[PDB]
Swiss-Prot record, chain A:
PROSITE patterns: RNA_POL_PHAGE_1, RNA_POL_PHAGE_2. Belongs to the phage and mitochondrial RNA polymerase family. It catalyses: RNA(n) + a ribonucleoside 5'-triphosphate = RNA(n+1) + diphosphate. It comes from the Viruses. One of its GO terms (molecular function) is DNA-directed RNA polymerase activity. Its EC number is 2.7.7.6. The lineage of its organism: Viruses, Duplodnaviria, Heunggongvirae, Uroviricota, Caudoviricetes. InterPro entries: DNA-dir_RNA_pol_helix_hairp_sf (IPR024075), DNA-dir_Rpol_C_phage-type (IPR046950), DNA-dir_Rpol_phage-type (IPR002092), DNA/RNA_pol_sf (IPR043502), RNA_POL_N_sf (IPR037159), RPOL_N (IPR029262). One of its GO terms (biological process) is DNA-templated viral transcription. This is T7 RNA polymerase. Highly processive DNA-dependent RNA polymerase that catalyzes the transcription of class II and class III viral genes. Recognizes a specific promoter sequence and enters first into an 'abortive phase' where very short transcripts are synthesized and released before proceeding to the processive transcription of long RNA chains. Unwinds the double-stranded DNA to expose the coding strand for templating. Participates in the initiation of viral DNA replication presumably by making primers accessible to the DNA polymerase, thus facilitating the DNA opening. Monomer. Interacts with T7 lysozyme; this interaction inhibits transcriptional function of T7 RNA polymerase.
Curated annotation (Swiss-Prot), chain B:
Pfam families: Amidase_2 (PF01510). Coiled coil: none annotated. Zn(2+) is required for amidase activity. Interacts with the viral RNA polymerase. This is Endolysin. SMART domains: Ami_2, PGRP. HAMAP family: ENDOLYSIN_T7. GO terms for cellular component: host cell cytoplasm. One of its GO terms (molecular function) is zinc ion binding. Its EC number is 3.5.1.28. The record marks Y45 as: Essential for amidase activity and zinc hydrate coordination. Residues 8-130 form the N-acetylmuramoyl-L-alanine amidase domain. Plays an important role in the switch between viral transcription and genome replication. Once produced in sufficient amount, interacts with and inhibits the viral RNA polymerase that becomes unable to produce additional late transcripts. This lysozyme-polymerase complex in turn plays an active role in viral genome replication and packaging.
Length: 774, 149
């Protein structure tokens, strides 16, 4: 935890990347990594001169930062709260880290408050601050498909340090606010809106700039970028993925404080690092033909005008990146985790974004598709159009039935625009290309487009396995052998069937008219049937139904039949719930079981006996099968507003999010256990499956998009077997719900609280091995 | 169910002591609650001895614990239920049935870890755990209140 000098440190990373991938690249990686803090005089001069957005804001900014630097210094009696903070930081960085962060933050069509924007920039200046030297030196080391993963060979000076910032939140805010100010004065780039909040507006000048014209964001890249050499295998809890020792380490888990992050340190769990790391080695590359289109096409109310002004800066940020590595034979993405398990990819540009990003990317290493591949490629592209409800056989057809249309898209802009009319334009266009190339090189070509597949629901799946009910395990379409049919639709018939059945022919339980006059489709009994977690019992169906189908029909005058509102919704709920409580029995059973352990786990001792009988409202924790520990502890915030009138005029008095001295929030704590647990599962299934599909069937490239994963068509078929066999292996090797029982029981009061709910009874499911095609 | 790394070696065996009174028949369950509140995935001790005589097993014998700091990476910690007077300070009020338990456990551990040394937290800490002179109790079955030994 310092053992070697500020030089050996600035050595190892480079000297390992050199000995490893090769010397030209060892310098391309770090060079690139340092782009987060400072651009460079090199990259800048060959850019400025060569062209005798971004050579404008940078020059003017370094200025103000220098004028002001000594303006204060007039050696008069008052020093501002950000001066020693900014001072030993080279403004070269300051002005950059400020232009670089402020644009990144305007990406968020969600929050863009002086407080957010300011604190964002704040955190950075500090990273630089604390790593500005190891960096500056490491640079000097010089002038401004290999599988490089190793499992021990990392020099012991590459082992991640402190991921968390030390500065006080307030302070971080002042530093950021001054940079934000100096930004507005030297370059009228942004401006405050609704002054008394939103720093997100970009003057009408730079606005049109970024959107309108030819690629301005040239030298302004995201704080986090893709690698050009294999990431670094994780071990320990900080410093992974990236190499540069002259920077701020990443954290295994994205936590809400260094304290939370620190409780993983002593934890032993191999499969988690295996998983994360396997997922990290996957090689990628830009799909240039799709890029070629996107390059041109992208140039051709009040509440939805905000997203338009922000989805633009994000479009540009990610078309500047795709082009940037358009030629690299390959690229990598370091990965991270949630406090609940999920694996997220660190860089802004990644295979987990809108479909344009999804399309602009593709696996950089392929196998011969052959018969099967080419099949699943078809099934894939169907889902890509929208034909994903109907069954597979008639799913294939849609494609041959449109053969010459996909091909026609061999001149994408010339009046093909058909692809653009699909559910996901680029996530499809790419498909045609792939399709075409198969139809030109044959079933012999090493195709590599990642094929992803999503399931009707996962959770109603694991519970069916866990409990061992058929009827539902078979309803989902994935547990046992059957003919793929949607559950959402299944729950529909049962709703209607019941309506007519005994509502009409059996207060106002005669609503089987209001609905039957409007129509009950599978498009109304599905939003809730997938909300078996946060959205819960019939009560949760009411507000969703009432919020999704009824009210929005009255708005356009299509619900005249619904004289009485709420009561209509409430009626359907009873129907959705009774239909679910029969279709997928164990899922509902398993969810009450937890909704029940939830009351106990987060309660406060109920003895009023007054003696050695107390149990603080505290945290609740649990461990997934691969060993990953989940700690849930929702704290009520403790805060005190600030006061800032610094821009000459405009008084601002925002609320400092929190100060870290909190007391539990028993509400959330209880209502967050069931859902956070299920998400927790998805995480632990994925990880397990990825490890298993890399050993059992040796697959190398993995694509993970919002909990859907795929490989190259060649391998597509084996993932499935991998999935199917992991489920089986899990619920056969032990009784996980029995284990979770003990796990929770262990966190209660002697016996007082040992009023635990009985584990649901298991059903009869064909020999788990029945779960797989066999 | 959560697993912790393994100590690359066991060189000491510490005896600490809750600050509970003779009326509290607490155990691992209760001691773990404290700790969860102290912010930990599991109890920081390996064994704990109830006023009863019962030796309840805590973290896995061979696992980095959270008991004696700057020492957790290489030693076994044993918490003795009891060690605080009915409203006051340290008082070696451990049960004789609870001392025999500690006796046999200790011989076992010291035999199974050749070289391992028997210690006390108030021997490396400004605190009063286990609250009694150990070396006297060990070498002589004499149990005396103290903060030395
Ligand atoms: Hg931000
Ligand atoms: Hg797609
Ligand atoms: Hg291909
Ligand atoms: Hg779902
Ligand atoms: Hg003690």
């Amino acid at each position: 935890k310092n053992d070697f000098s500020d030089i050996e440190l600035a050595a190892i990373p480079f000297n390992t990347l050199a000995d490893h991938y090769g010397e030209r690249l060892a310098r391309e990686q770090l060079a690139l990594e340092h782009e987060s803090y400072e651009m460079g005089e090199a990259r800048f001069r060959k850019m400025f001169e060569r062209q005798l957005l971004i050579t404008t804001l940078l020059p003017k900014m370094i200025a103000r930062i220098n004028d002001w630097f000594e303006e204060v210094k007039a050696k008069r009696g008052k020093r501002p709260t950000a001066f020693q903070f900014l001072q030993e930081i080279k403004p070269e960085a300051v002005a950059y880290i400020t232009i670089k962060t402020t644009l990144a933050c305007l990406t968020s069509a969600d929050n863009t408050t002086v407080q957010a924007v300011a604190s964002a920039i704040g955190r950075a200046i500090e990273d630089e601050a604390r790593f500005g030297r190891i960096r500056d030196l490491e640079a000097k080391h010089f002038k401004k498909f290999m599988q490089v993963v190793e499992a021990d060979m990392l020099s012991k000076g590459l082992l991640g340090g402190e991921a968390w910032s030390s500065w006080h939140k307030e302070d971080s805010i002042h530093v950021g606010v001054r940079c934000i100010e100096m930004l507005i004065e030297s370059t009228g780039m942004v401006s405050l809106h609704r002054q008394n909040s939103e720093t997100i507006e970009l003057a009408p000048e730079y606005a049109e700039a970024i959107a309108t014209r030819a690629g301005a964001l040239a030298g302004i890249s995201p704080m986090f970028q893709p690698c050009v050499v294999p990431p670094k295998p994780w071990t320990g809890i900080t410093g992974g993925g990236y190499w540069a020792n002259g920077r701020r380490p990443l954290a295994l888990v994205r936590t809400h404080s260094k304290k939370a992050l620190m409780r993983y340190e002593d934890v032993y769990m191999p499969e988690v690092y295996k998983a994360i790391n396997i997922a990290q080695n996957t090689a990628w590359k830009i799909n240039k033909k799709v890029l070629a289109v996107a390059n041109v096409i992208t140039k051709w109310v009040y509440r939805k005008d905000k997203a338009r002004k922000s989805r633009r800066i994000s479009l540009e940020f990610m078309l500047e990146q795709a082009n940037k590595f358009a030629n690299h034979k390959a690229i990598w993405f370091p990965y991270n985790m949630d406090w609940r398990g999920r694996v997220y990819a660190v860089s802004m540009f990644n295979p987990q974004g809108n479909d344009m990003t999804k399309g602009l990317l593709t696996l950089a290493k392929g196998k011969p598709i052959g018969k099967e591949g080419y099949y699943w490629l078809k099934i894939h592209g169907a889902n890509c159009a929208g034909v994903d409800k109907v069954p597979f056989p008639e799913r294939i057809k849609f494609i041959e039935e449109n053969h010459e249309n996909i091909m026609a898209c061999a001149k994408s802009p010339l009046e093909n625009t058909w692809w653009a009319e699909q559910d996901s334009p680029f996530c499809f266009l790419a498909f045609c290309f792939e399709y075409a190339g198969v139809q030109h090189h044959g079933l012999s070509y090493n195709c590599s487009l990642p094929l992803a597949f999503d399931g009707s629901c996962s959770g109603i799946q694991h519970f069916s396995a866990m409990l061992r009910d058929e009827v539902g395990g078979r309803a989902v379409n994935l547990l046992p052998s059957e003919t793929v049919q949607d559950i959402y639709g299944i729950v529909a018939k049962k709703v209607n069937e019941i309506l007519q059945a005994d509502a009409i022919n059996g207060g106002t339980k005669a609503l089987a008219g209001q609905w039957l006059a409007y129509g009950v489709t599978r498009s109304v009994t599905k939003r809730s049937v997938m909300t078996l977690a946060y959205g819960s019992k019939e009560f949760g169906f009411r507000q969703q139904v009432l919020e999704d189908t009824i009210q929005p029909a009255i708005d356009s005058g299509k619900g005249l039949m619904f004289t009485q509102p709420n009561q209509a919704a409430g009626y359907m709920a009873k129907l959705i719930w009774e239909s679910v409580s029969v279709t997928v029995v164990a899922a509902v059973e398993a969810m009450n079981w937890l909704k029940s352990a939830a009351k106990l786990l987060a309660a406060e001792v109920k003895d009023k006996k007054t003696g050695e009988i107390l149990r603080k409202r505290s945290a609740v924790h649990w461990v997934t099968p691969d060993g990953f520990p989940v700690w849930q502890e929702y704290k009520k915030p403790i805060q005190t507003r600030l006061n800032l009138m610094f821009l000459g005029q405009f008084r601002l008095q925002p609320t400092i999010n929190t100060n870290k001295d909190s007391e539990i929030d028993a509400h959330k704590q209880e209502s967050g256990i069931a859902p956070n647990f299920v998400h927790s599962q998805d995480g632990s299934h994925l990880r397990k499956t990825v490890v298993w599909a890399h050993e059992k069937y040796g697959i190398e490239s993995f694509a993970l998009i919002h909990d859907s994963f795929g490989t190259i068509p060649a391998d597509a078929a084996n993932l499935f077997k991998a999935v199917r066999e992991t489920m089986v292996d899990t619920y056969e090797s032990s009784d996980v719900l029995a284990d979770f029982y003990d796990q929770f029981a262990d966190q209660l009061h002697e016996s007082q609280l040992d009023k635990m709910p009985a584990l649901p009874a298991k059903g009869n499911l064909n020999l788990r091995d029945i779960l797989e095609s066999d | 169910r959560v697993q912790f790394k393994q100590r690359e070696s066991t060189d000491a065996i510490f005896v600490h002591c809750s600050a509970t009174k003779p009326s509290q028949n607490v155990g691992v369950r209760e001691i773990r609650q404290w700790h969860k509140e102290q912010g930990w995935l599991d109890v920081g001790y390996h064994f704990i001895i109830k006023r009863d005589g019962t030796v309840e097993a805590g973290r896995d014998e061979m696992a980095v614990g959270s008991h004696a700091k700057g020492y957790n990476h290489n030693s076994i910690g044993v918490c003795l239920v009891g060690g605080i007077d009915d409203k006051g300070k340290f008082d070696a009020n451990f049960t004789p049935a609870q001392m025999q338990s500690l006796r046999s456990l200790l011989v076992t551990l010291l035999a199974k870890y050749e070289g391992a040394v028997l210690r006390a937290h108030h021997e490396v800490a400004p605190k009063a755990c286990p609250s009694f002179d150990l070396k006297r109790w060990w070498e002589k079955n004499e149990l005396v209140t103290s903060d030395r030994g």
